[PDB]
Amino acid sequence: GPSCVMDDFRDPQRWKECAKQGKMPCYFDLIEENVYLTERKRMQCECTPLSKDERAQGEIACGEDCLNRLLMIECSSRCPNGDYCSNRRFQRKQHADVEVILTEKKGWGLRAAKDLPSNTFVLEYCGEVLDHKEFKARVKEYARNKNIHYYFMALKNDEIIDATQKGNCSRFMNHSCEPNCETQKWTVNGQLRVGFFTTKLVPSGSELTFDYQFQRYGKEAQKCFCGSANCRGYLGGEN
Ligand SMILES: Cc1ccc(F)c2cc(C(=O)N[C@@H]3CCC[C@H](N4CC[C@H](N(C)S(C)(=O)=O)C4)C3)[nH]c12
Ligand SMILES: C[S@@+](CC[C@H](N)C(=O)[O-])C[C@H]1O[C@@H](n2cnc3c(N)ncnc32)[C@H](O)[C@@H]1O
Ligand SMILES: [Zn+2]
Ligand SMILES: [Zn+2]
Ligand SMILES: [Zn+2]
């Protein structure tokens, strides 16, 4: 099919022109962090600073043993490893090399541009953060408009991320009943964010997918075309 790279979305003019020719997805507002529709001392880890030779050797500053990494909290600028800290991936946009592609029936999708090792950070899922009332309001709005794609993601109690109008290329990852990625909820400056992380080695060219768990709403449920042997048949939660 037709494909495009993440830089292609930085030009709002070349994009809208590309969209008309079915060589890029529909236009949306690109944002680099969540936008809270309604608005609702710090502790650094105890990792030992890495030596000049240790970093050169290929040692990880704030690796698997980091106090913050083990609670899925990112370190701040005030980390003892400073610049070298590998636990600031959201804040530094340390995203994987991914392309936006057209699938057969699922609309647009994400694929690995290179081989992606297991538990690699893909993309932060950014959008407008809604409460339970605002979310339910917009499902009815989107249903009335007769939208085909829905871009809701559960963040926490009374916080749902909506990437329908505003977000980034994370909003193109499709559901699979047998996924190669998962969601991980991460704390940055006392605030919870959600990103996609590989659960296995994704070969270059392979579509990136996660298991979208979300409580179903309404009578009609979207059919699943993920093509897996164990396909649940529909997107979301049991009922
Ligand atoms: C981020 C992401 C990745 C991959 C995915 F597959 C998804 C899917 C969603 C998503 O937001 N789905 C919506 C959840 C709320 C209920 C929505 N229903 C759809 C039909 C029904 N009617 C219009 S109705 C009222 O006519 O029954 C309402 C579906 N997000 C995804
Ligand atoms: C967050 S959007 C993903 C990007 C979407 N394909 C697009 O073109 O904008 C989720 C929507 O994509 C479609 N979708 C995602 N995964 C799917 C799947 N496994 N089977 C069928 N449709 C899927 C559904 O219409 C769903 O509401
Ligand atoms: Zn640390
Ligand atoms: Zn750190
Ligand atoms: Zn499926």
Side-chain angles (χ1 to χ4, degrees):
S3 88
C4 58
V5 305
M6 279 170 64
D7 278 358
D8 292 318
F9 293 88
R10 286 190 134 111
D11 191 353
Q13 301 294 75
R14 196 194 102 90
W15 180 6
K16 290 197 200 204
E17 296 305 320
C18 286
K20 274 151 203 138
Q21 303 173 7
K23 283 165 192 194
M24 287 183 79
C26 176
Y27 177 80
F28 65 86
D29 293 321
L30 193 59
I31 59 175
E32 67 159 17
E33 79 179 15
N34 287 331
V35 173
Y36 276 83
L37 187 57
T38 299
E39 290 273 42
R40 297 176 187 75
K41 180 57 177 172
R42 194 151 297 185
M43 294 309 267
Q44 70 204 20
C45 73
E46 296 186 342
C47 297
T48 303
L50 280 198
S51 74
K52 60 184 72 180
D53 300 291
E54 273 163 325
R55 169 148 172 97
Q57 182 61 236
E59 294 299 330
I60 313 308
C62 291
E64 64 188 354
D65 278 314
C66 179
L67 295 179
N68 283 326
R69 184 181 292 278
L70 285 164
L71 285 176
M72 305 173 77
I73 304 160
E74 291 215 333
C75 296
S76 63
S77 53
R78 301 294 301 273
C79 182
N81 281 297
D83 305 309
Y84 294 144
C85 179
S86 69
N87 188 36
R88 314 198 62 211
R89 295 174 287 174
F90 277 71
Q91 294 167 85
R92 296 191 167 283
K93 305 180 166 312
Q94 290 177 334
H95 68 55
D97 192 357
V98 298
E99 292 173 55
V100 177
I101 58 165
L102 181 59
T103 66
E104 290 179 349
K105 335 190 214 197
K106 302 187 289 190
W108 291 88
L110 286 185
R111 78 169 163 204
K114 300 162 173 163
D115 289 5
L116 307 179
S118 178
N119 203 355
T120 299
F121 173 48
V122 171
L123 283 172
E124 174 180 357
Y125 195 95
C126 290
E128 305 182 64
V129 185
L130 317 182
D131 75 356
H132 282 321
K133 292 180 300 184
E134 291 162 331
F135 155 72
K136 287 161 189 172
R138 284 201 177 183
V139 168
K140 284 183 296 186
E141 189 190 330
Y142 296 155
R144 257 147 33 199
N145 284 342
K146 301 174 194 305
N147 298 359
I148 293 183
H149 301 296
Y150 289 79
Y151 304 88
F152 296 118
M153 180 83 89
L155 181 52
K156 51 194 280 189
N157 283 2
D158 212 42
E159 293 193 27
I160 298 158
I161 302 166
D162 180 15
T164 315
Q165 296 153 224
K166 314 186 158 199
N168 65 350
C169 294
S170 66
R171 79 196 282 284
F172 291 117
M173 193 168 296
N174 287 314
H175 164 79
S176 177
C177 296
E178 202 188 3
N180 58 8
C181 301
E182 64 170 353
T183 60
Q184 290 179 24
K185 290 170 180 169
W186 279 82
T187 302
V188 184
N189 311 315
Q191 200 163 221
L192 204 72
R193 305 200 202 179
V194 54
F196 295 122
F197 297 75
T198 58
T199 54
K200 53 176 72 184
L201 203 182
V202 178
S204 187
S206 305
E207 188 177 16
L208 293 166
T209 58
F210 76 113
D211 189 349
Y212 181 72
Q213 294 282 312
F214 200 91
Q215 200 41 251
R216 249 161 233 158
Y217 282 93
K219 271 158 106 183
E220 268 98 61
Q222 293 187 299
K223 279 157 190 264
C224 183
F225 306 136
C226 82
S228 177
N230 317 134
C231 187
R232 298 195 309 264
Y234 305 94
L235 309 180
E238 69 291 351
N239 196 305

Short mmCIF file of all heavy atoms in Angstrom, two decimals, residues 45-47 61-63 66-68 75 79-81 85 87, ligand 3:
data_model
loop_
_atom_site.label_atom_id
_atom_site.label_comp_id
_atom_site.label_asym_id
_atom_site.label_seq_id
_atom_site.Cartn_x
_atom_site.Cartn_y
_atom_site.Cartn_z
N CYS A 45 15.92 8.86 42.23
CA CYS A 45 16.35 7.46 42.53
C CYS A 45 17.68 7.48 43.29
O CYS A 45 18.20 8.59 43.56
CB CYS A 45 16.50 6.66 41.24
SG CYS A 45 17.96 7.14 40.29
N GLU A 46 18.23 6.30 43.60
CA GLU A 46 19.49 6.13 44.37
C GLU A 46 20.51 5.33 43.54
O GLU A 46 21.32 4.60 44.14
CB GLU A 46 19.22 5.42 45.70
CG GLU A 46 18.34 6.21 46.65
CD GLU A 46 18.17 5.60 48.03
OE1 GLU A 46 18.46 4.39 48.18
OE2 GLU A 46 17.76 6.33 48.95
N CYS A 47 20.49 5.47 42.21
CA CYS A 47 21.49 4.86 41.29
C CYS A 47 22.83 5.59 41.45
O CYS A 47 22.81 6.81 41.74
CB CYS A 47 21.04 4.90 39.84
SG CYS A 47 19.53 3.96 39.52
N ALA A 61 22.82 3.61 32.40
CA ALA A 61 22.52 4.54 33.50
C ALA A 61 21.02 4.43 33.81
O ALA A 61 20.21 4.68 32.89
CB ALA A 61 22.92 5.95 33.13
N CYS A 62 20.68 4.04 35.04
CA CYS A 62 19.29 3.77 35.51
C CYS A 62 18.69 2.60 34.71
O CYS A 62 17.62 2.78 34.10
CB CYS A 62 18.42 5.02 35.41
SG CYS A 62 18.91 6.30 36.60
N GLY A 63 19.38 1.46 34.72
CA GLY A 63 18.95 0.22 34.05
C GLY A 63 17.81 -0.45 34.81
O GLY A 63 17.06 0.27 35.49
N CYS A 66 16.89 0.41 38.68
CA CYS A 66 16.57 1.80 39.11
C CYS A 66 15.28 1.82 39.94
O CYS A 66 14.31 1.15 39.55
CB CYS A 66 16.42 2.73 37.91
SG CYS A 66 16.00 4.43 38.38
N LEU A 67 15.27 2.58 41.04
CA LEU A 67 14.13 2.73 41.98
C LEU A 67 12.90 3.31 41.25
O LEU A 67 11.77 2.89 41.57
CB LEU A 67 14.52 3.66 43.13
CG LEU A 67 15.63 3.17 44.07
CD1 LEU A 67 15.92 4.22 45.13
CD2 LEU A 67 15.26 1.84 44.72
N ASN A 68 13.13 4.27 40.35
CA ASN A 68 12.06 4.97 39.59
C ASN A 68 11.53 4.05 38.48
O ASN A 68 10.30 3.96 38.34
CB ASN A 68 12.56 6.31 39.04
CG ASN A 68 12.60 7.39 40.10
OD1 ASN A 68 11.77 7.42 41.01
ND2 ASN A 68 13.57 8.29 40.00
N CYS A 75 12.76 9.46 35.69
CA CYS A 75 13.63 10.40 36.43
C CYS A 75 13.45 11.81 35.85
O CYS A 75 12.98 11.92 34.70
CB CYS A 75 15.10 10.01 36.34
SG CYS A 75 15.50 8.41 37.10
N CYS A 79 18.30 13.80 38.19
CA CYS A 79 18.80 12.41 38.35
C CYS A 79 20.31 12.43 38.61
O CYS A 79 21.01 13.25 38.04
CB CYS A 79 18.50 11.56 37.12
SG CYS A 79 19.03 9.83 37.28
N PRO A 80 20.85 11.53 39.46
CA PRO A 80 22.30 11.43 39.66
C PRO A 80 23.14 11.05 38.43
O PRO A 80 24.34 11.26 38.48
CB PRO A 80 22.45 10.32 40.72
CG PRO A 80 21.14 9.56 40.67
CD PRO A 80 20.10 10.61 40.34
N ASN A 81 22.52 10.52 37.37
CA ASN A 81 23.19 10.15 36.09
C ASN A 81 23.02 11.29 35.07
O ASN A 81 23.56 11.16 33.96
CB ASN A 81 22.67 8.82 35.56
CG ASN A 81 23.28 7.63 36.27
OD1 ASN A 81 24.49 7.42 36.21
ND2 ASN A 81 22.45 6.85 36.95
N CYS A 85 21.08 9.33 31.97
CA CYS A 85 19.89 8.56 32.45
C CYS A 85 19.07 8.05 31.25
O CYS A 85 18.64 8.88 30.41
CB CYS A 85 19.01 9.42 33.36
SG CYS A 85 17.54 8.55 33.96
N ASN A 87 16.20 6.48 31.61
CA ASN A 87 14.81 6.40 32.14
C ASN A 87 14.10 7.75 31.99
O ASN A 87 13.40 8.16 32.93
CB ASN A 87 14.81 5.93 33.60
CG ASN A 87 13.42 5.63 34.12
OD1 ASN A 87 12.58 5.13 33.38
ND2 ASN A 87 13.17 5.96 35.38
ZN ZN B 3 18.04 5.53 38.63
#
